[PDB]
Design a protein around this ligand. Structure first.
Ligand code: PC1
Ligand code: PC1
Ligand code: 3PE
Ligand code: 3PE
Ligand code: 3PE
Ligand code: DCQ
Ligand code: SF4
Ligand code: SF4
Ligand code: SF4
Lengths: 176, 51, 156, 110, 43, 314
């Protein structure tokens, strides 16, 4: 149930005493450390060649946000405001009105990528799989204002990354 | 909790708080390098300390 | 003419020298500093790009703000930024340094490190992966490459 | 003759490198900086330990200056006298070290 | 049903104890080696 | 004609220093399960050039120095004393053949601490001055054991001449009769050039915190030249090579290989162990190295008399 780390008494016979004194005078454990670091020199390093080689990822990965569409061109978001209600950082702003054919669609859908904590609550609170967190992560910008996405930017991200987002959703949707 | 869906109070007790409090007693009669070793031997993450 | 060609080649030389020896200093504030340490790990190897590990503040080129900048920490950040020799660059890592992030509406958190220092590269994430910070560093190198200091000096 | 030529060459190469290292960013017109140690204006505290180790080094250096001509002195005919004097000098070195050791001279910088 | 499960026989052995090889000669042997090197050099 | 010899001595020193920076970065990387620089050039062969140009176009610090005279003079002394400790080195023929080259080297090494002292005093920071004083004390305290070890080793040589040191080891290496002196000499030279595990100024202010990036690079280059020089001196002292008087290239290649291996051992040492405390290294010197150095000095005075093996004076 417990064990005694560092409760080993040293032996006081001449063999142990001479072993300890030879270890003191000739620096045995220093040679041990040197030799093992030398052994670690002759191994193949674990370095991958970025950007030509990428680290492994999973279909559950949470990167850049995107707005999806039905397989007929119609967008999936129906302005239910669950994603902005569940957002722990209040990064989502939604404004809605009935459009020309009477459908319930958003007129404003902003996500602040500097407020968002990339927690994935919005993509799991969506009843229609409209908002997703895509697999893209290399989207660093040179300006603060480029990280304030409107509806058009998110729709463009969805149209850009649909061919990967749909495959990731197909791979993962049976675990939800 | 007061019965609603949001907590009324949430105090977080972290061990780094007490260890950094005891750092004064730890580092008495030691050197500067012993001070940095004493800081190291307490697992101190200041996210849990300052909260 | 000849002078424009000379200043163009000299500009390419100095930009290659500056962008291929970026010595960073890192503000170890919060989670994003642990992810910076993970980019300095053997897998991603910040050193192989000419980007050393934990250089001194008095000789660094790029300053990385990885974590939350509180009200008690902001004057120290400005004091460290002011002592850096030029050319100096600032990379903002994670949402806390980008715009405040989770603690944006807090009473003791500065809403973005761009309210204190000028920022060149914004790395989004919470935390952004080591891949993402490496991408931000390489994008900073691309930004340094297309500088035109000597051409601007010649034209003025 | 050649030695002082080499000395002058090393000195002028070092001063050339230092001049280029100083005055080349002086030709840049970067900016003007205002800039308004952990101790702010504290006086340097006088420590007896650093002075003690400095004086101990100086005295041991003097006895080293005494010990230096041993390779030349080993060629003498009077080998017993030279051996006795050499052993006596190094024994005096050891005795001074032991007196510093026992009276807590090497304390907190051991 | 299909789930992420351990096998029927479980997994193989996994070590958790300290492993230090205790290699090299004894104190007497290394002292003898050093003294022999000194004697060869002096000769 | 002699200036050609001087130039071909001093320019490859700077080239070897820059490629020592590259080699140390790459070797530490491969010893820490990663890679060194391999992007700037083919296997990082262009890294020192880029780093040097970047450091020579960096903004200066422009400090409020108490004395601009010694602020100038400290890198002057550091570089001059780094370059002037190569001229009596036999390769296998020294550039300046000195009758007392060993003691000339000891004098220059003892004179080398004024750069630390003046760099510490020129900076207005008092903590920088305290760090400089501690570094100076460590440096002189290891000068003591350097002098005793060199004196005791030279009793098998017979003179202070560096060229005779090849002749002495014509039969066997000098590490065979003086290996405890070799170990203590290696550790003392490791602590002499302020290298790990004795580089206290990098552990918790350096003596040159207020120095500009250019002069800091000059100081660091002087330190690396000191490292290469000390390793070559150690190779000459304890690992002497076979010198054919008709083919000097044999000796040149042999001691070049041995000194490169010793410098790689320096870099191997610097990435294996934690740093010492100040009092711990003072304890290691004044209470461990010094008594054994004195005992071995008495042993190596009294030994060639009792063996009828006094080396010739000339
Ligand atoms: C061998 C070891 C390394 C040696 C040094 C490096 C090798 C290359 C040396 C020449 C590099 C280019 C000139 C120095 C760097 C200038 C960088 C800079 O800030 O330029 C803008 C500066 C100033 O340009 P500016 O007028 O735009 O000023 C910008 C700054 N404000 C607006 C705040 C005033 O340019 C210069 O100072 C020009 C210097 C000489 C240009 C080249 C002449 C021929 C050289 C051959
Ligand atoms: C140039 C050639 C290569 C040289 C070696 C290079 C590779 C090895 C590198 C090793 C690691 C280096 C980094 C760490 C350096 C700092 C640590 C260090 O060196 O500490 C030294 C340590 C320090 O000792 P310490 O601190 O452990 O001692 C304990 C002291 N108290 C208890 C007070 C705390 O050891 C020494 O100083 C010993 C020096 C060498 C002794 C040689 C003795 C020779 C044999 C004599 C005879 C013995 C038999 C008995 C008498 C018989 C008579 C007939
Ligand atoms: C004692 C020995 C000491 C040795 C020290 C040096 C060791 C390393 C030696 C060099 C190793 C290889 C370096 C190769 C550099 C890159 C060369 C190259 O191809 O550059 C291409 C680049 C862009 O070319 P561009 O025309 O734009 O391409 C479009 C065409 N598809 O074009 C450019 O960037 C412009 C041209 C650059 C040419 C660079 C050539 C190498 C420079 C090396 C400097 C040091 C040389 C040795 C000095 C000491 C010995 C004399
Ligand atoms: C009057 C006319 C002359 C005027 C003055 C100019 C003198 C010559 C200056 C150097 C040549 C000018 C061009 C400089 C490079 C421009 C082209 C360039 O950007 O090439 C990029 C290429 C590497 O591409 P990169 O973007 O790094 O990609 C990473 C891999 N994915 O880069 C490469 O392949 C390597 C580039 C090497 C550049 C040349 C070698 C370094 C400089 C040597 C001379 C100066 C220093 C001498 C030594 C000083 C002491 C250290
Ligand atoms: C802040 C100021 C500037 C600081 C930086 C520059 C100065 C410090 C760094 C350089 C130090 C140089 C030291 C020069 C003396 C070293 C001893 C010496 O010369 O030894 C060599 C040799 C004696 O050996 P030996 O073999 O016996 O002579 C030939 C016998 N057949 O002796 C000879 O061969 C003698 C040759 C003739 C005499 C030469 C005299 C040289 C000039 C005087 C000293 C110059 C330095 C002055 C400043 C010192 C430091 C402040
Ligand atoms: C004549 C001038 C030659 C060039 C100057 C010396 C070589 C450049 C050293 C630069 C450098 C490198 C590469 C370097 O890697 C390093 O990190 C340990 C430094 O110290 C912080 C350096 O100063
Ligand atoms: S991932 Fe989380 S923090 Fe980000 S927008 Fe979605 S719910 Fe908000
Ligand atoms: S949860 Fe889905 S459907 Fe509801 S408002 Fe958000 S994105 Fe639209
Ligand atoms: S952005 Fe996220 S990961 Fe980074 S410091 Fe803030 S809370 Fe931590």
């Amino acid at each position: 149930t417990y064990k005694y780390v560092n409760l080993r008494e040293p032996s006081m016979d001449m063999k142990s005493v001479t072993d300890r004194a030879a270890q003191t005078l000739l620096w045995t454990e220093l040679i041990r450390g040197l030799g093992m670091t030398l052994s670690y020199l002759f191994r193949e390093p674990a370095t991958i060649n970025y950007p030509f080689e990428k680290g492994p990822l999973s279909p559950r990965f949470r990167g850049e946000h995107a707005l999806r569409r039905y397989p007929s061109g119609e967008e999936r978001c129906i302005a239910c405001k669950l994603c902005e209600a569940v957002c722990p950082a209040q990064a989502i702003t939604i404004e809605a009105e009935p459009r020309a054919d009477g459908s319930r669609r958003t007129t404003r859908y902003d996500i602040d990528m500097t407020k968002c904590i990339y927690c994935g609550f919005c993509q799991e609170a969506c009843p229609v799989d409209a908002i997703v967190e895509g697999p893209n992560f290399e989207f660093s910008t040179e300006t603060h204002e480029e990280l304030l996405y409107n509806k058009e930017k998110l729709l463009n991200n969805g149209d850009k990354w649909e061919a990967e987002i749909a495959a990731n959703i197909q791979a993962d949707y049976l675990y939800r | 909790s007061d019965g609603s869906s949001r907590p009324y109070r949430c105090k977080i007790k972290a061990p780094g708080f007490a260890h950094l409090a005891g750092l004064d007693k730890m580092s008495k009669g030691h050197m500067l390098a012993d001070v940095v070793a004493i800081i190291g031997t307490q697992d101190i993450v200041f996210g849990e300390v300052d909260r | 003419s000849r002078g424009e060609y000379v200043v163009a080649k000299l500009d390419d030389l100095i930009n290659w020298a500056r962008r291929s020896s970026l010595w960073p200093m890192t503000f170890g504030l919060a989670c994003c500093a642990v992810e910076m340490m993970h980019m300095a790990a053997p897998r991603y190897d910040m050193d192989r790009f000419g980007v050393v590990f934990r250089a001194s503040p008095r000789q660094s080129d790029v300053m990385i703000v990885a974590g939350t900048l509180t009200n008690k920490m902001a004057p120290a950040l400005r004091k460290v930024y002011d002592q850096m020799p030029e050319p100096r660059y600032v990379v903002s890592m994670g949402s806390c340094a980008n715009g405040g992030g989770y603690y944006h509406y807090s009473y003791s958190v500065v809403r973005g490190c761009d309210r204190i220092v000028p920022v060149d590269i914004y790395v989004p994430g919470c935390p952004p992966t080591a891949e993402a910070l490496l991408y931000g560093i390489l994008q900073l190198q691309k930004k340094i490459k297309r500088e035109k200091r000597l051409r601007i000096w010649y034209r003025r | 003759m050649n030695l002082m030529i080499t000395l002058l060459t090393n000195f002028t190469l070092a001063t050339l490198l230092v001049t280029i290292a100083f005055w080349l960013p002086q030709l840049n017109v970067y900016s003007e900086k205002t800039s308004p140690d952990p101790m702010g204006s504290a006086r340097l505290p006088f420590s007896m330990k650093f002075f003690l180790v400095a004086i101990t080094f100086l005295l041991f250096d003097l006895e080293i200056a005494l010990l230096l001509p041993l390779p030349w002195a080993s060629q003498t005919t009077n080998l017993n006298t030279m051996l006795t004097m050499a052993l006596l000098l190094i024994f005096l070195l050891a005795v001074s070290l032991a007196y510093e050791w026992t009276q807590k001279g090497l304390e907190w910088t051991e | 049903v299909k789930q992420d499960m351990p096998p029927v026989g479980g997994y193989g052995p996994i070590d958790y104890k300290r492993n230090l090889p205790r290699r090299g000669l004894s104190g007497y042997s290394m002292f003898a080696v050093g003294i022999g090197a000194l004697l060869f050099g002096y000769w | 004609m002699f200036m050609i010899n001087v130039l071909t001595l001093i320019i490859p020193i700077l080239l070897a220093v820059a490629f020592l920076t590259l080699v140390e970065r790459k070797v530490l990387g491969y010893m820490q399960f990663r890679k060194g620089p391999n992007v700037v050039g083919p296997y990082g062969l262009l890294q020192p050039i880029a780093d040097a140009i970047k450091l020579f176009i960096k903004e200066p610090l422009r400090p409020a120095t108490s004395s601009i005279s010694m602020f100038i003079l400290a890198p002057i002394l550091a570089l001059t004393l780094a370059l002037t400790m190569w001229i009596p080195l036999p390769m296998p023929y020294p550039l300046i053949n000195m009758n007392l080259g060993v003691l000339f080297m000891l004098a220059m090494s003892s004179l080398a601490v004024y750069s630390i002292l003046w760099s510490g005093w020129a900076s207005n920071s008092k903590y920088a001055l305290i760090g400089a004083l501690r570094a100076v004390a460590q440096t002189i305290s290891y000068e003591v054991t350097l002098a005793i070890i060199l004196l005791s080793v030279l009793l098998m040589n017979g003179s202070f001449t560096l060229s005779t040191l090849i002749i002495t080891q014509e039969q066997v290496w000098l590490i065979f009769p003086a290996w405890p002196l070799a170990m203590m000499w290696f550790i003392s030279t490791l602590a002499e050039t302020n290298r790990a595990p004795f580089d206290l100024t990098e552990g918790e202010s350096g003596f040159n915190v207020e120095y500009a990036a250019g002069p800091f690079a000059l100081f660091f280059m002087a330190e690396y030249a000191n490292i290469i020089m000390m390793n070559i001196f150690t190779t000459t002292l304890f690992l002497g090579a076979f010198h054919n008087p008709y083919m000097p290239e044999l000796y040149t290649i042999n001691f070049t290989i041995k000194s490169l291996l010793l410098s790689i051992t320096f870099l191997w040492i610097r990435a294996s162990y934690p740093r010492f405390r100040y009092d711990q290294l003072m304890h290691l010197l004044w209470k461990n190295f010094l008594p054994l150095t004195l005992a071995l000095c008495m042993w190596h005075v009294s030994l060639p008399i009792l063996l009828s093996s006094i080396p010739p004076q000339t």
